[PDB]
Each structure stands twice: as C-alpha cells, then as structure tokens.
Amino acid sequence: PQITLWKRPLVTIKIGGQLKEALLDTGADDTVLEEMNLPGRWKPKMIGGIGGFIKVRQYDQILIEICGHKAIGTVLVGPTPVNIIGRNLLTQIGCTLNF
C-alpha cells in the first residue's frame, strides 16, 4: 500500500504470537518494541534518541509480520513509549520513501 504522513504511520504487526500497533519509522536504525516477555536468550543494549538513552534487551532472529509482509531480524525490547519498526525490518518488506 501507500501511507501518507498526515498522521502517525501506525500499522498492525504480529510478533511472538501477539498483535500490536507499531510505527513505521525511517529514522530508526533498529526495531524497538514495548516491554514484552519474549522467550530465548538476549543481550543487553542501550539505544539513544531525543532525551537520552534507554536500556533494552536485544533478541535476534525474531519473526515479525507487518501488514502481511513477513520479516525476521533483530528486535529490541525495553521501556519505549511506542512500538517502532526500524530500517532493519522496513528494508525486508520493501518499504521506500517517495516524493
């Protein structure tokens, strides 16, 4: 589809057996999701933005479905105020910017 930017580009995603709403975020290198108890091993990480850094748990090789487009990659879990789909997964679903 084509998503205009009058409002926040929110879409439904499926991860770890659950449905959620997440932002398609071209400014995000990585994908950051609200706190959730995924299984498996993880590695600590810190990611920075406006306001400073937050601590997150890096899970690798996680499947996410974004508007029916499947994508598997690294997902960070932590106290983010919003679920954020970053470029690591946006590339996998063929997402481009166009003007």
Ligand X SMILES: CCOP(=O)(COc1ccc(C[C@H](NC(=O)O[C@H]2CO[C@H]3OCC[C@H]32)[C@H](O)CN(CC(CC)CC)S(=O)(=O)c2ccc3c(c2)OCO3)cc1)OCC
Q: What is the dihedral of CA 24, 26, 27, 29, to 10 degrees?
A: 90
Identify the residue among 17, 39, 40, 81 touching a second copy (CB under 8 A): 81
How many residues bind a second copy (CB under 8 A)? The answer is 40
Taking contact as CB under 8 A, which single stretch among the options 13-21, 34-42, 44-52, 57-65 is the one that binds a second copy? 44-52
Is 60 annotated in the active site?
A: no
Kindly state the tokens that stand for 16.
């770890």
Minimum gap (Å) between residue 40 Cβ and a second copy: 23
Choose the stretch contacting a second copy; rule: CB under 8 A; options: 17-25, 37-45, 57-65: 17-25
95/60 Cα distance (integer angstroms): 21
89: number of Cβ within 10 Å? 26
Kindly state the DSSP code that residue 27 receives in the 8-state scheme.
Answer: T
Catalytic residues: 25
